[PDB]
Design a protein around this ligand. Structure first.
Ligand SMILES: CC(C)(COP(=O)(O)OP(=O)(O)OC[C@@H]1O[C@H](n2cnc3c(N)ncnc32)[C@@H](O)[C@@H]1OP(=O)(O)O)[C@@H](O)C(=O)NCCC(=O)NCCS
Ligand SMILES: CC(C)(COP(=O)(O)OP(=O)(O)OC[C@@H]1O[C@H](n2cnc3c(N)ncnc32)[C@@H](O)[C@@H]1OP(=O)(O)O)[C@@H](O)C(=O)NCCC(=O)NCCS
Ligand SMILES: [Zn+2]
Ligand SMILES: [Zn+2]
Lengths: 130, 133
């Protein structure tokens, strides 16, 4: 997916659907998550890289139907002190279906702490940006 | 829940947890959704069709982690009415403390496309809220 360093495929499940036959709003975040976890695996993925989700902003652009070909890309768009801002793009049949902006927070001892330089450099390398 | 006309209780499932033992970010939206649906049930019979609304946007702030065993309540209320849209605030509490807040934009559909919220639905919302809206 152009503009995104990591992208994954997801198969729409019957279980993902609302009664009218389109993907449920919360399930979109699980699609976005698969991409983010794969991205974290590159920069303790079971511990979500020691990051916790502090905020998620999602715009649902087009409904996702059973059988749709779905891809999800993810990239870092901001690097803070203890936070990381990530953009996730879910497409259905080549069309943008949802955009999610998430704020991830690095924890140490269960409290926010400055992202380690080791993680910052791996992110800069992955994104190819300073 | 003070300030919310509709609230529901949620039981945290083992299935709801991330490996570290706290509730998954996406599951929080399903908690919020239960209250929203219960609310729509108060205004319309077509609740399976989600009151004919589709979620256009959700803004969720995760304030505190929710753990297995936590006593969870979810309150929901309409904070604004648009043309074909409406804004709803969802409050999830865990053991009496604010765990997450969600602001959602719901859009009313007719024939599969946005249409003005009917007066009948608006009147019921205003009645359920019992406050200027
Ligand atoms: C994430 C969490 C640790 C933040 O706690 P906090 O008291 O806000 O800590 P701070 O405000 O000092 O954290 C730093 C800030 O995080 C931010 N942040 C936290 N919540 C935010 C939000 N809702 N929106 C935007 N930014 C937020 C920052 O903007 C700032 O980042 P910075 O370090 O780059 O300056 C806490 O809210 C969390 O425990 N809530 C539950 C998270 C939930 O469990 N995630 C779902 C499971 S993964
Ligand atoms: C929601 C949806 C019907 C909107 O289609 P659209 O072409 O943008 O329709 P319009 O722009 O004419 O709708 C009117 C606008 O909706 C808004 N709206 C739509 N998307 C919005 C967003 N992402 N954020 C804020 N407002 C939004 C308005 O702000 C405005 O409302 P108004 O009637 O009060 O003026 C369409 O994007 C939807 O099919 N996306 C998929 C939704 C998804 O399936 N939900 C998950 C399952 S419930
Ligand atoms: Zn987690
Ligand atoms: Zn739906």
């Amino acid at each position: 997916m152009e503009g995104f360093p990591v992208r994954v495929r997801v198969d729409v499940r019957f279980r993902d659907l609302d009664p009218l036959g389109h993907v449920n709003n919360a399930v979109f975040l699980s699609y976005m998550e698969l991409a983010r976890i794969r991205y974290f695996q590159r920069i303790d993925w079971l511990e979500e890289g020691h990051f916790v989700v502090a905020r998620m902003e999602v715009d649902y652009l087009r409904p996702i139907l059973l059988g749709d070909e779905v891809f999800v890309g993810v990239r870092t768009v901001g690097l803070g002190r203890s936070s990381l801002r990530m953009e996730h793009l879910v497409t259905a049949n080549g069309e943008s279906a949802a955009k999610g902006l998430g704020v991830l927070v690095w924890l140490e001892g269960g409290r926010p702490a400055p992202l380690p330089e080791a993680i910052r450099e791996r992110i800069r390398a992955l994104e190819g940006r300073p």
